């Protein structure tokens, strides 16, 4: 019964915080900082390893910039779903966790839209829903065939590999991100383009979900780079950068380089924090430099990990493609710098809520030299 | 309909193997599908309430 | 108005009413200590600042 | 050397009025300066923010455009654009995403028309526009019912919201 | 060297050789050997057989391209309006022609490759360059002036890239290990492994 | 060494704490103090220590810094030419950009780690993208050109560095490693091919020089082109000699073609800065080929000729910038009668143009003699090819001088006291090196 | 109509309101010509008038590629002569197909 | 006045060419739905594909890239006609 | 200033760093499923 207590404490924590927030709901505290701190404390009871501590760190940094009890509660729900995705041992765990996370995404997207933004945000949420239904239905049908044929539910199969390709957002499965994250709140796009990936990477590494095929990561890299270079809108540029990088990280993870992808996801979270929560041009400039992989900042270390892992596996086509696609993506990042300082006078909203933005920029500048051992 | 088809396949496999895994996965499918449909119907109703007068078949995006 | 249970800090932001709980009283005394220490540090800084000390006062109407 | 200096004209002489048909069907007399682009003159008058959309070019989104209907006689003053460049790309996306079926042979975008003396008492109309989205802040639901002004928008252009 | 007086680098004696020493005591391999199907498809002995084995890839690619274009057309046609013309009569030529022309280009490429290798008798870069040149020439039969030059060059360059990074690159860096002692330098005192690291199992997807 | 590195780190540090009205004065004092620290580094560098004069490490392989013959010459050259850049540039933004660029470049020269070299050298990527693409007088196309060219070449170099770090376990120069792989050799080579402008990867340099400010052009020509030879002597020749000897006919083909076609392209120029920028490209090929011979003469001659170029081309760029300030034109056809109108500017212009044509009393002569001797050691025809086509440089230099020299002009455009102060150190250094104090 | 802007004493002030035009650095600026400016624009943007013609391909190949081919042949001949001169075995150059592995001479060996 | 690039073509003809992009725009879910479905089934079938030579794979990729039609190209040129 | 001692100390530091890196590069799979490759690792599963 003692082993069950570890999981049960997290429930009891979440429930009592929920009922306390429901009772203590007032206009005097619309920004419920106290429940945010309570949620952060409660999520410490789920840390058991380094990857779980990274999950906690990103979850807390995300919950800081959500406003209200309700959105923070659904971020806690996303954290629970992610924690169970890491611990899933067969098909049922994978399914339960990931469509719980999909439900949390739908709710978070719906509740952060204004009345004037409903026409496009609800359309994007609906399109995401239907595509996710396609993915889940195919997954569970093939899972039924596999469970019939083998008599057991084993998470080392092609079915879960393709389902996790959909979850990662690689090669033919990246369009839901483009449609949904273009029309949703910037924080929602930021937290759901970084945090979900860590659980999928952990599941792939631990449960041996790797394929010999390199087509999908190659397609992700080339398509992401070329579409980023051809995209006029800034949101599409940032969204396609993730497709390219996650294709490259998928190629690295299949070969067993778990440590490097676990560092890359964290450095990418920190790098994307500043450009998505754009309040200052200089912070966004450093963030864009970090995403490009540029040397003075921590983003150079994260990209260097992946590239260094590539030369070890000694696949020439991947390296050649990596160089050319990296140049193509660099052109789009340079477009982003040009738009801020070299096109026209720029005036932005004075949204002085840089909770972890200054800390993230400081970490990007500073952290390069301490982490140099990694590469 | 498709989710029900998959859940029925899992129940069929459970009967074939005399195992309880498919029964559990099927109740899981029922719950998750119902929750997804409720949220999606919420989004559909909200989408239809925000339609502008000029928009004609808002629900039929596939046209 | 609809509700009458609004927190006193919410109703009187300019000056909170006299502390009534023990914790509130301790916070009040700690604030008094902080105020005195801050004024002392202010005067010490004003000595280095030179003639005038960057002092400020209310102006006449 | 030292030819005669030409004194400048006062604002009254170099103001032309254009009659603009708005979406509701009312006709507005928009006083405008010669040498100004049509988009700027329309923005300064006080038309609502739904009436305008950013120029959908890589580096032109700070400019605010409108879908306008130009009489055949004034088609000459519209600016030529090179198809092999990206200005034509801005124009093609603005037709593809905003105008769509509402296009007519008189359809043009305001930035490519510059007001001059011969365009005095010209009658133009705002062309119908389809719902468009770039960012949640910069979007058009399809309802022309906000009473703000595009003038009162300090925000230069679309970036991450 | 880092000095201006004597040449940089060094030289190794050609007379002196160093006995090979194993990177580890026991070798466990997670890299699977080529399948018999791969060796069958790679076999260029009979040019007709080689062509017929490798064309399904080209036909598949042409079918996806034609399906993409045909769906772009189908998506546009209005369901609400009844159409006098038959849509499939419009759409079938697209897919069929795309697939046929793709298959023809791939057939020229594979046939010329196998024929050149048989006649030359050696596996070389030149077979791929000549097959690509012929395929690009077929691509630009009636096309305007830059294209007679550019397509033979691009189609010839593609097999060069495939050979350089698909065959030469892996074979050049087989020996390099990354663990224990550097492949050239075993005299240096580095931790010597009993077994090689297995970072992943042999794949089976 | 430690003092030099500390002062290099101190210069960008000072800008954060200065009053923003004292910035120019503080920056000039910091530049001169860095020059003095470089002189101290030369003093504490004993020739008895033949391999490396000085090596310092600050806790990791990346923090390993050291000076050799090439590194010491290039670092003294950059520290010498930086103050002139400082005085030429006005504004806190411009000062900040130029100081950060110089700190990164000067740290690259003394670095002994390929990855740290890459990290420091490419840190100045956006700074040039912003600098060359400045609001009124900059061009976005040139900034795009330079940024993309640098990114692709440096990424290839980075991939080769990763492979070396995986195979050997180290990528520091002080650890002896040799490789025969051609892919890694090309990965290291492509950076040198692009950074040292070598046909057909030379297109970025012209557009950058024309649309960069005079201080920016001075730094670019003075030391950023020389970073190629630091990379070649430090990170390519020690490890990739087998590949340079395998590809020597190809290397000569590309180098001599760059020399010839850059000389011919110079003839078609109407802009003074473009003329100087193309002269630089033709000059780089002799350096690259002389080093590639991997002989004692070649390395010394290449580093010497780099010093000669880094004393002659900054002077020409500075004089052209002064003339453009006085005239607001760079077209040779607009500029006439400069001999009568600007006798003092004309004297220095002719002196530096003679230096660029490698006349005996100039350092370019000694440097060229050594480089040609190395080429002659390889083969007679190699030297003969370079010696003949040097006449093309004379044609365009003489045409430019003749066009500027005489005519009718109604404007006195001659340099002020500030301008003469700006070039006096370069003239003195040119004379001192020309008499043999190379 | 003109006045001296510069003051050596250090009491320099820019008279932006002065009726007389200051003799500042812009005083000596070259007047410029409309057609010369258009010639400069044409000459810089000469890529607009680039057309692929058989004559253009002929010129580019015969001069550029011809010079590259000639230089490569001469360099290969010089390498062959030097190998015969030095007494080295025929070196394995990149595009030469040689069944010898000799690349770098051994300093210790006597050739 | 400044030297400027010559723009080929007439102003109204170029504007008429650009106006051929203003056509009824389908929503992208219809394409995405089919691509997702056929892509899932395609990934399932790929594991069963025979191993192809790298040269043939690269040539197939080149042919696919050449044969790919941008969605805007069909948009401008689409005619609801036989 | 003993240049010989400084040179040898610096070289020793770099060589030690290389040895440490090559030890650090010796990595088997840490996957929880992979009990064969890690048979000797001391672990407890709570599942
Ligand atoms: C203070 C001492 C700390 C030193 C050691 C730490 C261990 C003791 C933990 C003590 C707690 C200190 C926390 C520090 C680390 C946290 C780890 C941890 O906690 O669990 C690990 C620890 C044992 O796991 P392990 O040591 O990792 O070994 C297991 C296996 O080796 C499997 O694990 P593995 O994954 O490590 O396997 C080895 C791995 C080797 O992996 C490594 O080498 C690790 C490298 C270090 C990375 C460090 C960064 C990680 C970021 C997380 C930040 C920590 C957040 C703290 C969260 C917990 C707070 C207590 O090899 C791999 O290949 C796997 C890949 C690993 C990931 C790749 C690393 C990249 C990380 C990302 C870096 C990217 C840069 C970002 C920017 C950085 C710029 C400077 O578990 C515990 O000891 C118990 C956990 C209990 C936590 C909370 C429970 C107490 C409170 C309960 C009630 C709570 C409610 C009341 C609240 C009260 C307050 C109000
Ligand atoms: C009934 C349903 C209809 C669909 C039917 C099929 C259903 C799917 C079934 C299975 C799907 C899985 C496999 C399909 C391919 C995966 C792509 C995908 O699914 O992404 C979702 C994608 C939609 O995603 P999206 O985000 O909405 O669209 C992004 C674009 O911006 C879209 O916007 P955009 O169209 O306006 O812009 C297109 C843009 C987008 O950019 C791309 O397309 C990127 C593609 C680059 C290659 C991709 C990686 C190739 C690696 C293949 C790996 C296998 C081989 C391994 C070895 C190869 C080594 C490289 O590219 C272009 O601008 C046009 C050029 C296209 C290729 C560019 C490269 C040219 C190189 C040739 C040089 C020669 C020129 C020399 C002369 C030049 C003179 C100066 O759906 C599809 O497009 C599927 C259509 C299937 C047709 C593909 C035909 C061939 C397929 C195999 C050949 C592989 C080459 C790829 C060709 C282009 C494919 C896009
Ligand atoms: C080895 C370290 C390197 C590895 C890095 C990963 C490890 C991270 C370790 C350091 C983490 C530091 C994180 C810094 C976050 C910055 C603090 C912050 O965000 O405060 C917010 C917090 O905002 C909130 O929402 C408050 C609610 C939560 C308050 C904090 C909750 C504390 C919970 C307890 C956590 C204790 C840990 C539990 C036991 C481990 C306040 O900012 P705002 O008011 O929202 O806006 C700022 C406006 N402006 C700056 C422009 C003036
Ligand atoms: C705005 C400018 C106005 C001012 C004009 C200044 C006028 C300059 C006067 C011209 C000077 C000509 C002197 C040329 C000789 C160079 C001086 C020299 O190099 O000093 C020699 C000492 O030699 C002499 O003193 C030479 C004596 C000069 C007087 C001899 C007769 C004068 C006739 C001139 C002919 C000189 C031709 C030399 C050609 C190279 C240093 O001796 P070392 O210790 O051995 O130095 C090492 C050698 N190395 C420099 C290469 C590193
Ligand atoms: C990125 C490399 C792509 C090449 C770019 C070249 C320019 C593109 C123009 C397209 C022309 C088609 C590509 C031809 C390039 C091959 C070079 C021709 C040399 C040659 O014919 O020898 C072959 C071997 O060279 C070879 O085929 C292998 C040589 C590898 C090519 C050169 C690699 C470095 C070039 C990088 C230059 C700068 C990069 C910028 C593009 C024959 O050999 P054999 O074995 O068949 O013997 C014959 C027994 N029958
Ligand atoms: C297995 C893979 C098989 C091979 C597949 C190959 C596929 C293609 C790979 C090409 C990768 C190279 C990436 C560079 C692309 C060229 C630059 C883009 C052209 C361009 O328009 O950029 C504009 C300016 O760039 C400029 O002004 C720069 C001018 C050109 C730069 C020169 C290129 C660098 C040197 C090339 C070779 C170097 C050595 C190679 C080893 C800015 O466009 P915008 O920001 O306004 O966006 C608006 C969108 N239209
Ligand atoms: C066509 C003229 C050549 C243009 C180059 C002009 C001069 C450049 C020389 C640079 C000097 C050092 C570079 C090493 C070799 C580079 C190219 C040498 C010529 C070459 O391509 O030889 C090939 C061998 O090299 C190879 O197999 C690899 C070639 C380079 C690969 C291209 C891109 C690599 C990028 C890798 C990034 C870093 C990766 C690090 C892991 C084939 O000659 P062969 O011996 O097969 O003879 C068969 C003939 N019948
Ligand atoms: C598509 C792009 C290309 C299309 C256009 C290409 C047309 C150019 C073709 C002609 C180029 C000039 C001729 C050089 C190549 C000759 C044929 C190559 C075969 C060859 O190497 O023969 C050697 C030629 O003599 C030599 O060693 C070279 C003599 C000619 C060089 C001097 C003439 C020009 C001088 C100008 C200065 C250029 C060189 C500066 C160093 C002598 O045979 P072998 O005894 O060496 O044995 C070597 C065994 N084949």
Distance of CA E193 to the CA centre of its chain: 35
- Concatenating the DSSP letter of every residue in E85-136 gives S-HHHHHHHHHHHHHHHHHHHHHHHHHHHHHHHHHH-S--HHHHHHHHHHHH
- Going by C-beta distance under 8 Å and a sequence separation of 6 or more, which residues neighbour residue A31? A67, A68
User: Are the C-beta atoms of A262 and A198 separated by less than 8 Å?
Assistant: yes
Q: Cβ A148–B9 below 8 Å, yes or no? A: yes
- Concatenating the DSSP letter of every residue in F365-386 gives HHHHHHHHHHHHHH-HHHHHHH
- Concatenating the DSSP letter of every residue in F205-260 gives HHHHHHHS-HHHHHHIIIIITTHHHHHIIIIIHHHHHHHHHHTHHHHHHHHHHHHH
* Residue G47, burial from CB neighbour count under 10 angstroms (0-12, 13-18, 19+): exposed
Residue F118: strand, helix, or coil: helix
Give the separation between CA B24 and CA A260, rounded to whole angstroms.
Answer: 37
C-beta neighbour count of E198 within 10 angstroms: 18
Closest CA to A251 of A324, A336, A313: A313
Please state whether beta strands D15-21 and D123-126 pair in parallel, antiparallel, or not at all (unpaired).
Answer: parallel
Distance of CA A344 to the CA centre of its chain: 32
Residues of chain B contacting residue E78, judged by C-beta atoms under 8 Å apart: 63
How many Å lie between the alpha carbon of A28 and the closest alpha carbon of chain C? 7
Rounded (10°) CA dihedral F193, F195, F196, F197 = 80
- Ligand closest in space to the Cα of A169: 2
C-beta neighbour count of A353 within 10 angstroms: 11
H/E stretch holding F152 reads helix F140-167
How many Å lie between the alpha carbon of G22 and the closest alpha carbon of chain F? 15
Closest CA to A96 of A68, A129, A136, A57: A136
For chain B, the chains sharing at least 3 beta-carbon pairs closer than 8 angstroms are: A, D, E, H
Distance of CA H38 to the CA centre of its chain: 18
Structure tokens at A234: 């800034």
Give the separation between CA A50 and CA A55, rounded to whole angstroms.
Answer: 9
**Resolution of this structure in Å:** 3.1
Structure tokens at A40: 């952060």
- E156 pocket-lining for ligand 5 (C-beta < 6 Å): yes
Beta bridge partners of F121: none
- I44, I46, I47: best to mutate for the A interface, most A CBs within 10 A: I46
Distance of CA E78 to the CA centre of its chain: 43
- Please tell me the distance between residue A246's alpha carbon and the centre of ligand 2 in angstroms: 18
Residues of chain A contacting residue B63, judged by C-beta atoms under 8 Å apart: none
Give the separation between CA G73 and CA D119, rounded to whole angstroms.
Answer: 70
Distance of CA A55 to the CA centre of its chain: 11
**Which residue among A61, A191, A355 is best mutated to probe the pocket of ligand 3, counting the most ligand atoms within 8 A of its Cβ?**
A355
Closest CA to F121 of F137, F130, F110: F110
- Concatenating the DSSP letter of every residue in F281-336 gives HHHHHHHHHHHHT-SHHHHHHHHHHHHHHHHHHHHHHHHHHHHHHHHS--BTTT--
- Ligand closest in space to the Cα of F243: 7
DSSP state of D4: P
Q: Ligand 8, closest atom to CA G66? A: 8
Residue F275: strand, helix, or coil: helix
Residue of A nearest to E204 (CA): A211
- A160 pocket-lining for ligand 1 (C-beta < 6 Å): no
Reply yes or no: is the peptide bond before residue F200 cis, omega within 30 of 0: yes
DSSP state of D95: I
For D38-44, the CB contacts below 8 A with 24+ separation are D38/D66, D38/D68, D38/D110, D38/D111, D38/D113, D38/D114, D38/D115, D38/D124, D39/D63, D39/D64, D39/D65, D39/D66, D39/D109, D39/D110, D39/D111, D41/D115, D42/D66, D42/D110, D43/D150, D43/D151, D44/D151
From residue F305, alpha-carbon distances to D53, F255, F302 in Å are 58, 16, 5
Residue D53: strand, helix, or coil: strand
Q: Ligand 1, closest atom to CA A56? A: 57
Closest CA to F218 of F131, F345, F305, F109: F131
Give the separation between CA B22 and CA B12, rounded to whole angstroms.
Answer: 8
Structure tokens at F346: 């004309």
Give the separation between CA G44 and CA F271, rounded to whole angstroms.
Answer: 10
Residues of chain G contacting residue F247, judged by C-beta atoms under 8 Å apart: 93-94
Reply yes or no: is the peptide bond before residue A65 cis, omega within 30 of 0: no
- Pick the residue whose CA is nearest to atom 45 on ligand 6: A335
User: Are the C-beta atoms of G106 and G88 separated by less than 8 Å?
Assistant: no
**Which residue among F435, F436, F438 is best mutated to probe the pocket of ligand 4, counting the most ligand atoms within 8 A of its Cβ?**
F435
Structure tokens at F411: 């404007």
- Going by C-beta distance under 8 Å and a sequence separation of 6 or more, which residues neighbour residue A348? A278, A279, A281, D155, D159
C-beta neighbour count of F350 within 10 angstroms: 14
Give the separation between CA A203 and CA I31, rounded to whole angstroms.
Answer: 9
How many Å lie between the alpha carbon of F182 and the closest alpha carbon of chain E? 9
Give the separation between CA F120 and CA F114, rounded to whole angstroms.
Answer: 10
* E30–chain I Cβ distance below 8 A for any pair: no
- G78 pocket-lining for ligand 8 (C-beta < 6 Å): no
User: Are the C-beta atoms of F101 and F257 separated by less than 8 Å?
Assistant: no
Closest CA to A86 of A57, A56, A51, A60: A51
DSSP state of D17: E
Give the separation between CA F415 and CA F394, rounded to whole angstroms.
Answer: 26
Distance of CA F370 to the CA centre of its chain: 19
Angle CA G28–G31–G36, to nearest 5: 135
- Pick the residue whose CA is nearest to atom 16 on ligand 4: F435
- F144 pocket-lining for ligand 6 (C-beta < 6 Å): yes
User: Are the C-beta atoms of D96 and H22 separated by less than 8 Å?
Assistant: yes
H/E stretch holding D139 reads strand D139-140
3-class SS string, chain C = CCCCCCCHHHHCCCCCCCCCCHHHHHHHHHHHHHHHHHHHHHHHHHHHHCCCCCCCCCCCC
H/E stretch holding I39 reads none
Indicate which technique resolved this structure: cryo-EM
Burial H54-63 (b: 16+ CB within 10 A, else e): bbbbbbbbbb
- Rounded to a whole number, what is the distance in angstroms from the first to the last CA of chain D? 57
- Ligand closest in space to the Cα of H40: 2
Q: Cβ H37–A134 below 8 Å, yes or no? A: yes
- Ligand closest in space to the Cα of F149: 6
Closest CA to A143 of F14, B14, D152: B14
Q: Cβ E189–I19 below 8 Å, yes or no? A: yes
* B53–chain H Cβ distance below 8 A for any pair: no
- Pick the residue whose CA is nearest to atom 8 on ligand 6: A324
Give the separation between CA A156 and CA A154, rounded to whole angstroms.
Answer: 5
Distance of CA D116 to the CA centre of its chain: 15
Give the separation between CA I13 and CA I31, rounded to whole angstroms.
Answer: 34
Structure tokens at G49: 């008038």
Number of C-alpha atoms within 13 angstroms, CB side, residue A247? Answer: 28
- Pick the residue whose CA is nearest to atom 12 on ligand 8: G70
Q: Ligand 7, closest atom to CA E168? A: 27
Q: Cβ E201–A208 below 8 Å, yes or no? A: yes
- Going by C-beta distance under 8 Å and a sequence separation of 6 or more, which residues neighbour residue A212? E203, E205
- F183 pocket-lining for ligand 7 (C-beta < 6 Å): yes
Residue F174: strand, helix, or coil: coil
Widest pairwise Cα distance in chain G? 88
Residue B37: strand, helix, or coil: helix
Structure tokens at F81: 């030419």
User: Are the C-beta atoms of F124 and A295 separated by less than 8 Å?
Assistant: no
How many Å lie between the alpha carbon of F219 and the closest alpha carbon of chain I? 33
- F126 pocket-lining for ligand 4 (C-beta < 6 Å): no
Please state whether beta strands D132-133 and D139-140 pair in parallel, antiparallel, or not at all (unpaired).
Answer: antiparallel
H/E stretch holding D29 reads strand D27-33
- Going by C-beta distance under 8 Å and a sequence separation of 6 or more, which residues neighbour residue A188? A108, A109, A112, A181
DSSP state of A65: H
Q: Which residue has the tokens 């693409």?
A: F133
Give the separation between CA A122 and CA A110, rounded to whole angstroms.
Answer: 7
D100: left (phi over 0), alpha (psi -120 to 50) or beta: left
Beta bridge partners of B34: none
């Amino acid at each position: 019964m003692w082993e069950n207590l570890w999981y049960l404490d997290i429930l009891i924590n979440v429930l009592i915080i929920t009922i306390f927030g429901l009772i203590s709901c007032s206009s005097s505290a619309t920004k419920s900082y106290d429940l945010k701190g309570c949620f952060i404390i409660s999520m410490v009871g789920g840390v058991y390893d380094i990857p779980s501590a990274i999950l906690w760190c990103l979850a807390s940094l995300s919950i800081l910039n959500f406003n209200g009890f309700f959105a923070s509660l659904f971020l806690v729900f996303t954290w629970i779903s992610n924690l169970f995705a890491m611990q899933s041992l067969n098909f049922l765990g994978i399914y339960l966790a990931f469509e719980m996370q999909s439900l949390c995404l739908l709710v978070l997207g719906k509740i952060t839209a204004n009345e004037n933004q409903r026409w496009f945000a609800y359309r994007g949420l609906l399109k995401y829903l239907v595509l996710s239904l396609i993915a889940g239905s195919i997954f569970i049908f093939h899972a039924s065939s596999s469970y019939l044929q083998s008599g057991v539910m084993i998470s080392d199969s092609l079915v879960t590999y393709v389902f996790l390709l959909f979850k990662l957002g690689v090669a033919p499965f990246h369009m839901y991100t483009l449609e949904l994250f273009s029309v949703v709140s910037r924080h929602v796009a930021f937290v759901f383009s970084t945090l979900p990936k860590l659980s999928v990477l952990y599941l792939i590494s631990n449960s041996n979900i790797g394929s010999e095929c390199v087509w999908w990561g190659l397609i992700s890299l080339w398509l992401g780079s070329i579409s980023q270079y051809q995209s006029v809108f800034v949101r599409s540029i940032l969204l396609y950068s993730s497709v390219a990088e996650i294709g490259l990280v998928l190629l690295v993870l299949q070969e067993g380089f778990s440590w490097e992808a676990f560092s890359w996801v964290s450095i990418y979270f920190l790098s994307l924090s500043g450009v998505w929560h754009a309040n200052s041009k200089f912070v966004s400039a450093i963030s864009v430099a970090s995403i490009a992989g540029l040397p003075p900042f921590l983003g150079f270390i994260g990209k260097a990990q992946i590239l260094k892992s590539l030369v070890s596996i000694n696949l020439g086509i991947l390296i050649f493609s990596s160089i050319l696609a990296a140049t193509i993506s660099f052109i789009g990042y340079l477009r982003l710098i040009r738009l801020m300082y070299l096109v026209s006078p720029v005036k932005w909203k004075n949204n002085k809520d840089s909770s972890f933005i200054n800390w993230s920029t400081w970490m990007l500048t500073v952290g390069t030299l301490p982490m140099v051992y990694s590469v | 309909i498709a989710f029900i088809a998959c859940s029925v396949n899992f129940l069929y496999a459970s009967a074939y193997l005399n195992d309880m895994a498919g029964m559990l996965f099927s109740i899981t499918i029922t719950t998750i599908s119902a929750c997804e449909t409720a949220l999606g119907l919420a989004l559909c109703v909200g989408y239809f309430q925000s339609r502008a007068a000029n928009e004609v078949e808002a629900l039929n995006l596939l046209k | 108005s609809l509700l009458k249970n609004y927190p006193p800090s919410y109703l009187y932001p300019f000056r909170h009413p006299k502390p009534e709980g023990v914790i509130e009283k301790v916070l009040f005394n700690l604030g008094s200590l902080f105020r005195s220490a801050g004024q002392g540090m202010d005067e010490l800084g004003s000595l280095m600042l030179g003639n005038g000390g960057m002092q400020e006062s209310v102006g006449p109407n | 050397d030292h030819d005669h200096y030409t004194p400048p004209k006062t604002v009254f002489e170099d103001t032309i009025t254009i009659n603009v048909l708005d979406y509701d069907g009312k006709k507005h007399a928009v006083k405008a300066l010669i040498g100004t682009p049509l988009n700027k003159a329309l923005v300064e008058y006080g038309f609502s923010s739904t009436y305008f959309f950013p120029n959908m070019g890589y580096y032109t989104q700070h400019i605010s455009d409108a879908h306008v209907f130009i009489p055949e006689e004034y088609w000459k003053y519209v600016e030529n654009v090179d198809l092999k460049t990206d200005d034509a790309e801005a124009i093609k996306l603005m037709f593809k995403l905003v105008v769509q079926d509402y296009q007519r042979e008189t359809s043009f975008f305001a930035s490519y028309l510059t007001l001059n003396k011969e365009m005095d008492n010209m009658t133009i109309g705002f062309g119908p526009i389809k719902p468009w989205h770039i960012t949640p802040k910069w979007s058009f639901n399809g309802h022309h019912n906000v009473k703000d002004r595009m003038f009162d928008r300090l925000e230069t252009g679309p970036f991450i919201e | 060297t880092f000095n201006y007086v004597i040449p940089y680098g060094g030289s190794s004696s050609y007379t002196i050789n160093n006995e090979p020493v194993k990177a580890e005591e026991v070798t466990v391999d997670f890299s699977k050997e080529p399948s018999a199907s791969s060796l069958k498809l790679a076999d260029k002995s009979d040019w007709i057989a080689y062509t017929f084995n490798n064309v399904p890839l080209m036909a598949t690619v042409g079918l996806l391209a034609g399906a993409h274009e045909a769906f772009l057309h189908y998506e546009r046609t209005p369901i609400y309006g009844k159409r006098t013309y038959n849509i499939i009569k419009k759409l079938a030529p697209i897919v069929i022609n795309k697939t046929a022309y793709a298959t023809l280009l791939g057939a020229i490429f594979c046939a010329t490759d196998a024929l050149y290798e048989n006649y030359s008798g050696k596996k070389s870069y030149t077979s791929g360059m000549v097959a690509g040149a012929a395929t690009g020439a077929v691509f630009a039969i009636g096309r305007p002036l830059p294209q007679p030059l550019v397509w033979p060059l691009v189609f010839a360059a593609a097999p060069v890239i495939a050979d350089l990074f698909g065959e030469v690159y892996p074979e050049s860096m087989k020996s390099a290990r990354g663990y224990g002692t550097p492949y050239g330098f075993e005299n240096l005192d580095d931790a010597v492994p009993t077994r090689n690291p297995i970072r992943r199992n042999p794949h089976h997807y | 060494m430690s003092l030099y590195l500390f002062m290099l780190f101190l210069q960008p540090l000072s800008l954060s704490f200065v009053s923003r009205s004292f910035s120019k004065i503080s920056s000039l004092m910091m530049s001169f103090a860095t020059l003095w620290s470089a002189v101290y580094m030369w003093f504490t560098s004993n020739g008895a220590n033949q391999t490396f004069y000085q090596v310092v490490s600050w806790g990791s392989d990346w923090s390993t810094f050291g000076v050799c013959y090439t590194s010491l010459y290039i670092s003294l050259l950059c520290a010498f030419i930086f103050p002139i850049c400082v005085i030429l540039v006005q504004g806190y933004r411009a000062l900040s950009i130029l100081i950060c660029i110089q700190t990164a470049v000067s740290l690259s020269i003394v670095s002994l780690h390929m990855l740290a070299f890459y990290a420091l050298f490419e840190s100045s990527l956006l700074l040039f993208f912003i600098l060359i693409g400045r609001r009124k007088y900059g061009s976005l196309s040139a900034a795009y050109n330079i940024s993309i060219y640098t990114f692709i070449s440096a990424l290839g170099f980075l991939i080769s560095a990763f492979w070396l770090n995986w195979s050997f376990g180290s990528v520091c120069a002080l650890l002896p490693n040799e490789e025969a792989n051609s892919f890694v050799a090309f990965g290291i080579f492509i950076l040198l091919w692009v950074k040292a402008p070598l046909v057909p990867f030379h297109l970025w340099l012209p557009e950058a020089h024309v649309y960069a400010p005079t201080a920016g052009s001075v730094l670019l020509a003075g030391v950023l082109l020389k970073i190629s030879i630091v990379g070649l002597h430090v990170f390519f020749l020690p490890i990739c000699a087998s590949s340079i000897v395998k590809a020597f006919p190809l290397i000569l083909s590309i180098c001599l073609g760059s020399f010839i076609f850059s000389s011919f392209s110079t003839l078609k120029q109407i802009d003074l800065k473009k003329i100087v920028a193309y002269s630089s490209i033709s000059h780089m090929a002799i350096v690259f080929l002389s080093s590639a011979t991997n002989s004692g003469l070649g390395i010394q001659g290449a580093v010497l000729y780099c010093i000669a170029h880094g004393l002659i081309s900054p002077g020409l760029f500075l004089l052209v910038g002064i003339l453009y300030k006085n005239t607001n034109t760079k077209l040779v056809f607009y500029l006439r009668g400069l001999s009568q109108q600007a006798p003092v500017w004309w004297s220095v212009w002719v002196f530096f143009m003679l230096g660029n044509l490698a006349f005996p009393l100039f350092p370019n002569f000694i440097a060229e003699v050594v480089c040609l001797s190395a080429l002659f050691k390889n083969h007679e025809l190699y030297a003969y090819a370079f010696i003949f086509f040097s006449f093309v440089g004379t044609v365009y230099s003489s045409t430019v001088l003749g066009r500027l020299k005489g005519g009718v002009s109604s404007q006195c455009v001659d340099a002020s006291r500030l301008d003469v102060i700006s070039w006096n150190p370069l003239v003195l250094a040119t004379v001192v090196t020309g008499i043999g104090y190379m | 109509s003109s006045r001296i802007a510069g003051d050596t004493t250090g009491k320099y002030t820019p008279n932006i309101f002065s009726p007389e035009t200051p003799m500042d650095r812009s005083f000596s600026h070259v007047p410029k010509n409309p057609f010369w400016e258009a010639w400069v624009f044409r000459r810089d943007n000469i890529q607009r008038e680039f057309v692929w013609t058989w004559q253009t391909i002929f010129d580019l190949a015969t001069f550029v590629g011809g010079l590259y081919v000639a230089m490569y042949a001469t360099a290969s001949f010089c390498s062959r002569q030097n190998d015969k001169r030095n007494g080295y075995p025929e070196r394995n150059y990149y595009f030469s197909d040689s069944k010898s592995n000799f690349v770098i001479p051994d300093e210790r060996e006597f050739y | 006045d400044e030297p400027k690039h010559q723009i080929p073509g007439n102003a109204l003809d170029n504007w008429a060419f650009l106006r051929t992009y203003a056509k009824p725009l389908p929503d992208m879910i219809h394409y995405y739905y089919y691509v997702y479905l056929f892509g899932f089934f395609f990934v399932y079938k790929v594991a069963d594909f025979p191993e192809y030579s790298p040269r043939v794979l690269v040539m197939a990729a080149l042919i696919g890239s050449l044969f790919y039609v941008r969605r805007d190209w069909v948009h401008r040129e689409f005619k609801d006609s036989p | 200033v003993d240049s010989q001692a400084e040179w040898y100390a610096e070289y020793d530091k770099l060589e030690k760093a290389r040895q440490k890196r090559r030890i650090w590069k010796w990595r088997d799979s840490d996957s929880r499923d992979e009990y064969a490759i890690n048979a000797e690792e001391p672990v407890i599963y709570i599942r």
